[PDB]
């Protein structure tokens, strides 16, 4: 029998490591359908900010215009979502981009030749030969010159090489950055990989002590199997460290004396980040999207 | 197409949301059906799949000149031995989960890194639709033409196919 | 051409690691396997994006119609 | 076998094309049936 109090008693969270970019943690005693939904929303439904429309005024570089617009869209901006609202893609362009929807970035690079003494490196040989993502300038349009003055818009990875130039060439563009979800386009996906794996279970059946444990050590990652004696002979130290390579199954000494299963309700989530949000915060933002995804159906009239 | 004569049309662009994911967290870029293998017998693609994954891990490149290997020096043993030293499966398989249901797939899936190629000829100038339009002046029949917005030809063999059904009004 | 901004499979930003990679090979004289692992690429899908890039933009830039010679 | 990709050697040759005879000499011996054949119309024995 199942309940919500019966789920609250058994559910556990064990947080392995937490960082500004990645976060490993466990979800114990939850179903695969729920944990796949958390993995799903983090890739596909948590919104983020990325450049959507690019307005080239001049581009005399080698890179095509539509190629260079594509590269700007893939640059992860460190804008916090919930500072922006959502655009409305039906009412036309004279009314659509407000200062509360949109963040304007600009790029204005010219390449000139550097007079140098010496087959030489082009940082010492041209001026502004490489264009990086840190050359994107935040232009605080409208009344949000004061709410983005606390922390302005910057790319989360400022050394992304966008274009390369030679003297005479220039790029002058202006990109509007809008809010969107990763199901629409992968540039809005706030996670570098939201994924899980299921906890490996290594069931030893017969005692395989002795030198038949020294070679049972080596069929697993190093921290996985331990040895003491014929007593506490060969046991699982950490069944979380194991990559399921099944290397012990191709030796005939152990094809009867071990199994490889999974612990089916114990998930090991590894959430990374593209940069805009910390990975513990887009797990909260995912578990609340699924909750509101059900409220909006509960609070909705059943039609016809 | 890969480098083995395994060409294939892109049938659907499938979202990462519900594509299968591995222990590493990787969704594959290309899915190829294993029913394209038993009648083609392109076994160079199976050994390229585990050679290429061994090279992406260790950062090395592999020679695939013919007749380097031997029947006593099988490359599934060579590049399999390199996957085992990295910590992957010897046979090239990976434990992989379902993107749609979230459950673990039944057998470990043969995943690897194969060099792919995009062919030049594409399907743009291939479709056309006509409700009515231009005619010919002699016959008052629909004009020919892909870009002249022209009709589709019901030829001689299709006239015989419409009599064979006994459909006198579809012929009419 | 230029280095891909993101990786095709994983989606890690990879475009900031091409000049770092060429200095780990040149200055530090690392092999390609150690150089990719110090850059923090460890999924083999994200490894092959830096490992196997050709960088033809350096060969296109020699044909400049806007400067003499 | 070991067969490396010459990643620093490629990028040096992209930025700095050679000022001597070309690298990749097997590539010019692939069209030696065409170039040498045309060259025998003006150069060689008996004019």
């Amino acid at each position: 029998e199942w309940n919500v109090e019966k789920f609250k008693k058994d559910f556990e969270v064990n947080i392995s490591s937490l960082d500004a970019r990645e976060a490993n943690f466990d979800l114990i005693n939850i179903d695969t359908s729920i944990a796949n939904a958390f993995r799903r929303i983090m890739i596909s439904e948590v919104p983020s900010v990325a450049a959507e429309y690019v307005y080239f005024f001049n581009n005399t570089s080698v890179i095509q215009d539509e190629v260079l617009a594509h590269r700007i869209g893939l640059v992860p901006l460190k804008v916090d979502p919930d500072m922006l609202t959502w655009v409305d893609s039906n009412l036309p362009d004279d009314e659509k981009f407000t200062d509360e929807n949109t963040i304007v970035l600009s790029l204005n690079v010219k390449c000139t030749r550097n007079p140098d003494a010496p087959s030489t490196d082009p940082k010492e040989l041209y001026n502004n030969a490489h264009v990086y993502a840190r050359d994107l300038k935040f232009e605080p349009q409208g009344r949000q010159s004061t709410t983005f003055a606390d922390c302005p818009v910057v790319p989360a990875d400022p050394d992304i090489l966008l274009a390369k130039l030679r003297p005479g060439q220039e790029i002058s563009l202006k990109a509007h950055c809008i809010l969107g979800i990763g199901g629409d386009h992968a540039k809005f996906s706030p996670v570098s990989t939201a994924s899980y794996r299921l906890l490996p279970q290594i069931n030893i059946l017969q005692p395989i002590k002795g030198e038949s444990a020294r070679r049972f050590q080596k069929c697993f990652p190093p921290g996985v199997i331990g040895i003491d004696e014929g007593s506490d002979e060969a046991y699982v130290k950490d069944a979380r460290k194991d990559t399921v390579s099944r290397e012990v199954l191709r030796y005939e000494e152990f094809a009867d004396k071990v199994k490889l299963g999974r612990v089916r309700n114990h998930f090991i989530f590894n959430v990374e980040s593209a940069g805009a949000m910390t990975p513990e915060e887009i797990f909260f933002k995912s578990v609340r999207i699924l909750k509101n995804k059900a409220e909006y159906l509960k609070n909705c009239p059943i039609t016809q | 197409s890969s480098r083995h004569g395994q060409k294939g049309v892109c049938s659907r662009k499938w979202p990462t949301i519900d594509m299968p994911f591995s222990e590493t967290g990787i969704q594959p870029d290309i899915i190829i059906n294993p029913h394209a293998f038993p009648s083609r017998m392109t076994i160079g693609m199976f050994v390229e799949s585990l050679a290429g994954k061994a090279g992406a891990l260790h950062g090395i490149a592999q020679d695939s000149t013919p007749w380097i290997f031997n029947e006593d020096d099988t490359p599934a043993d060579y590049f399999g031995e390199q996957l085992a030293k990295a910590g992957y499966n010897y046979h090239g398989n990976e434990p992989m989960y379902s993107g749609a249901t979230g459950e673990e797939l039944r057998a470990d899936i043969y995943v690897g890194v194969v060099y792919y190629q995009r062919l030049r000829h594409m399907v743009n100038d291939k479709f056309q639709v006509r409700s009515t339009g231009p005619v010919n002046s002699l016959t008052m029949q629909p004009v020919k033409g892909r870009k002249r917005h022209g009709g589709i030809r019901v030829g001689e063999m299709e006239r015989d196919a419409l009599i064979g059904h006994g459909t006198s009004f579809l012929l009419q | 051409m230029i280095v891909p901004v993101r990786c095709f499979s994983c989606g890690k930003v990879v475009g900031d690691k091409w000049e770092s990679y060429l200095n780990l090979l040149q200055e530090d004289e690392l092999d390609e396997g150690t150089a990719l692992s110090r850059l923090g690429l460890k999924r083999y899908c994200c490894r092959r994006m830096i490992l196997t890039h050709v960088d033809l933009i350096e060969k296109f830039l020699r044909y400049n119609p806007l400067e003499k010679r | 076998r070991t067969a490396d990709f010459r990643t620093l050697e490629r990028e040096s040759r992209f930025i700095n094309p050679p000022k001597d005879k070309s690298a990749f000499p097997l590539l010019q011996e692939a069209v030696q049936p065409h170039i040498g054949s045309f060259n025998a119309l003006t150069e060689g024995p008996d004019g």
């Binding site: 990652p221 190093p222 460290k241 990559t243 090991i268 | 222990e23 910590g87 | - | 070991t2």
Partner: peptide, 24 residues
């Protein structure tokens, strides 16, 4: 006949998620 050269110096380069080279 000389064998295909086994590349020397190959190490553990697939660690499980959240783990790194903690194996010493």
């Amino acid at each position: 006949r000389k064998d295909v050269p086994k590349v020397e110096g190959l190490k553990l380069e697939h660690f499980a998620t959240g783990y790194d080279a903690e194996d010493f």
